[PDB]
């Protein structure tokens, strides 16, 4: 099954009352770590992280995050100066990796300014893709440090994947479980002469689910309306797909196929 590890950073200049800096880590859809400029402490966000990582992990990363917080503030200040921007602006970072089912891996590192792509790292050419002339100025300064580029490529391809495999083992009872979906089909005449069919699923984990409507055994040409995959609040998810009308709903979840004939 595909899994990922990602760390986010959010910096806000001149915030209301709201932390100046927040950093959160995730394994798949699960928060694992948190740090902000108010607590000034890195803490676990999953009990399987708290039980498997000794206090020295949290103590050391608290210090590193206090340094990264200070760097983020300065970087956001320089971006505002380059853009000639006043007031409150946001700066974001996302770093991470994925370990695919076939054992292959992906790695990514990206920055955003005011919630829009700003700089995207290409670990295969060791270069930063810039969206505008300010991002280009930063790209030139960052690409001048060859050692840092190589360090980032190593971290994405080796370190990130080793951390992800370690955290996957810690959280295996959560992350590697399967809760099959409970699926139902509801039929109703809506506007006169228009029948809608809803295929609804709930109680499933992992959130990844494939739902479609088929006619006489073939895919439709008519429009399918898709419901978002939503958290139900108990660690499981729900989703739906609907059509207007031999129809059958097809659901695939974690290597199991299901057909509901109407």
């Amino acid at each position, epitope marked *: 099954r595909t899994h990922s590890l990602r760390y986010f950073r959010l910096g806000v200049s001149d915030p209301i009352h709201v932390p100046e800096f927040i950093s959160v880590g995730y394994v798949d859809s699960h928060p694992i770590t948190t740090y902000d400029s108010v607590t000034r402490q890195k803490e676990p966000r999953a009990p399987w992280m708290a039980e498997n990582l000794a206090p020295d992990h949290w103590e050391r990363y608290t*210090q*590193l995050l206090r340094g990264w917080q200070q760097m983020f503030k300065v970087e956001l200040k320089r971006l505002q100066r380059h853009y000639n921007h006043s007031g409150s602006h946001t700066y974001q970072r996302m770093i991470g990796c994925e370990l695919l089912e076939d054992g292959s891996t992906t790695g990514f590192l990206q920055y955003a300014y005011d919630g829009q792509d700003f700089l995207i790292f290409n670990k295969d050419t060791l270069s930063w893709l810039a969206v505008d002339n300010v991002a280009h100025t930063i790209k030139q300064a960052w690409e001048a440090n060859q050692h840092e580029l190589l360090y980032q490529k190593n971290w994405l391809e080796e370190e990130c994947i080793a951390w992800l495999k370690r955290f996957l083992e810690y959280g295996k009872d959560t992350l590697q479980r399967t809760e099959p979906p409970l699926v139902r089909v509801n039929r109703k005449e809506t506007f006169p002469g228009v029948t809608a069919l809803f295929c609804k699923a709930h109680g499933f984990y992992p959130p990844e689910i494939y739902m479609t409507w088929m006619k006489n055994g073939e895919e439709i040409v008519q429009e399918i309306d898709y419901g978002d995959i939503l958290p139900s609040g108990d660690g499981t998810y729900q989703a739906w797909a609907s059509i207007e009308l031999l129809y059958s709903c097809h659901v695939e979840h974690s290597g199991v196929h299901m057909v509901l004939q109407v």
Partner: antibody
Framework: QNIDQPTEMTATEGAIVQINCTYQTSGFNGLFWYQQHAGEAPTFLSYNVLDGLEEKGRFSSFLSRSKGYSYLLLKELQMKDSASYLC??????????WGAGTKLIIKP | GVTQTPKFQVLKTGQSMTLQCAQDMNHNSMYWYRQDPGMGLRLIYYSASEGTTDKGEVPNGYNVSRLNKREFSLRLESAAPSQTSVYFCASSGGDSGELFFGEGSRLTVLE
């Protein structure tokens, strides 16, 4: 957890010397070499984090991440190369583990 | 780069001592190491940025002050002969950044 480099090496002026450094760490974020003349401060020589050899004048630094091995190679040795050479490996938490240093003696 | 003082100091057992260190390279991270024969450098205390400090590997008998972004002082509360050593201050830009070392401070603690 562990890093090893020879205590001392002796080579002849004009020749070549290879200083080996092996490390076993909990994760890896780079391998550094420093030069430290007697009674002076250490000064940065090289950094390797991907596999390969980097040349900087008469000095080259090699890394094999799969073998947890690095070497510092000094060519056309001069009496001024007599110094201690420190290798340091950065672990997964960006902490350095330092070798005890190699004292390099150059025979005129 | 990194300016540390004093170069040499003789102390009597139980005497107090402060080593000074300043860097003008705009580095967030600063470190205090001791160097002793036959072993690798040992971190005493470090400061990941202004406003924070933390223990290294051998913090006992020492304390530090990150006075501002430039300066990081090391204090020997009650000098002990085991503290006879060569002390190095250093700074780094962080991540893959190398260390920049101060000139070193040779301390000898005598009964």
């Amino acid at each position: 957890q562990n890093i090893d480099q020879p205590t001392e090496m002796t080579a002849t002026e004009g020749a070549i010397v290879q200083i080996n450094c092996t490390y076993q760490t909990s994760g890896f974020n780079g391998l550094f070499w420093y030069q430290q003349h007697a009674g002076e401060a250490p000064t940065f020589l090289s950094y390797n984090v991907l596999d390969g050899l980097e040349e900087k004048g008469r000095f080259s630094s090699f890394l094999s991440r799969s073998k947890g091995y690095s070497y510092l190679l000094l060519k056309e040795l001069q009496m001024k190369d007599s110094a201690s050479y420190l290798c340091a490996a950065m672990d997964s938490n960006y902490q350095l583990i330092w070798g005890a240093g190699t004292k390099l003696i150059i025979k005129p | 780069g990194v300016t540390q003082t004093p170069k040499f100091q003789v102390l009597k057992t139980g005497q107090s001592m402060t080593l000074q260190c300043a860097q003008d390279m705009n580095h967030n991270s600063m470190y205090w190491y001791r160097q002793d024969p036959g072993m690798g450098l040992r971190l005493i205390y470090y400061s990941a940025s202004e406003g924070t400090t933390d223990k290294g590997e051998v913090p006992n008998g020492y304390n530090v002050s990150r006075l501002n972004k430039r300066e990081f002082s090391l204090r020997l509360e009650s000098a002990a002969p085991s503290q006879t050593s060569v002390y190095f201050c250093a700074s780094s830009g962080g991540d893959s950044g190398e260390l920049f070392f101060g000139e070193g401070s040779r301390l000898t603690v005598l009964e």
